């Protein structure tokens, strides 16, 4: 509620729960190495 | 058609290595899932490891840090290394091919493996 | 992780007739398991896509069955190419794991 940001990407998709842990930093996984990468240092929230 | 050729294997003394290698007729395996997999009697199967088409790996959890798999895409050879062979590990391994997820379709000969003082 | 049971723990039989071969898992899934074929001292083979599909190598008379936890396996018109044994793997997620085995015999 305090903090200001230049810009801010709301990516949604639809999956299955034992691919949920997949969306972290520095996974690997069907989907972490076919459909969506994600940064080492990646700052933000994952809701699912 | 598609064939799976390997090699090597065989026993050696608790602690040691071994390295085992694994080629293809027709199947480049630069384009393909690949998996290894090993049969004791009287046990059955067991899952090993396998590397996907992206070059990421997995392993199962009894041997990680432990079992090595490498590729050599130049030749359509696949290269495995197992370092600390232990106990009741002697038994024959096989390289297989998956379509879907998961679904070993081709098969090699087998390669045994052993393990005693 | 998840364990598979094979059942029942030999089949004995005469060809030309149906086979049935059931299989239950610890934790239920859905549409996740298949069957492999090994005549000893050979290649283990792949038989059925899923809980239905069929291979394209492989003759009509194979026929798989799945549920939630029970899973079992239906050949009809036994034939002697057949005398092998059987197993489970699963293709869900644990990571995967196999069966226990069942050996078909034919009979005369």
């Known amino acids: 509620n305090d903090l200001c940001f230049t810009n801010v990407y709301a990516d949604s998709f639809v999956i299955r729960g034992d691919e949920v842990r997949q969306i972290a930093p520095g996974q690997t996984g069907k989907i972490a190495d076919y459909n969506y990468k994600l940064p080492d240092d990646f700052t933000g929230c994952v809701i699912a | 058609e598609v064939q799976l050729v390997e090699s090597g294997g065989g026993l050696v003394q608790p602690g040691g290595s071994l390295r085992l290698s694994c080629a293809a007729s027709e199947i480049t395996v630069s384009r393909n899932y690949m998996s290894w997999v090993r049969q004791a009697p009287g046990k059955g199967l067991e899952w090993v490891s396998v590397?996907?088409?992206?070059?990421?790996?997995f392993y199962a959890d009894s041997v990680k840090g432990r079992f090595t798999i490498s590729r050599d895409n130049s030749r359509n050879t696949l290269y495995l290394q197992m370092n600390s062979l232990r106990a009741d590990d002697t038994a024959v391994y096989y390289c297989?091919?998956?379509?879907?997820?998961?679904?070993?379709?081709?098969w090699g000969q087998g390669t045994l493996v052993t393990v005693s003082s | 992780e998840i364990v598979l049971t094979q059942s029942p723990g030999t089949l004995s039989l005469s060809p030309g007739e149906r086979a049935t071969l059931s299989c239950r898992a610890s934790q239920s899934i859905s549409s996740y398991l298949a069957w492999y074929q090994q005549k000893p001292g050979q290649a283990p083979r792949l038989l059925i896509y899923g809980a239905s599909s069929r291979a394209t190598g492989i003759p009509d008379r194979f026929s798989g069955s799945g549920s939630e936890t029970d899973f079992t396996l239906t050949i009809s018109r036994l034939e002697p190419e057949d005398f092998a044994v059987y197993f489970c793997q699963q293709y869900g997620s644990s990571p995967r794991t196999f069966g226990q085995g069942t050996k078909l015999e034919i009979k005369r």
């Open positions: 297989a091919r998956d379509y879907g997820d998961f679904y070993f379709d081709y």
């Open positions: 590397i996907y088409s992206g070059g990421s790996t």
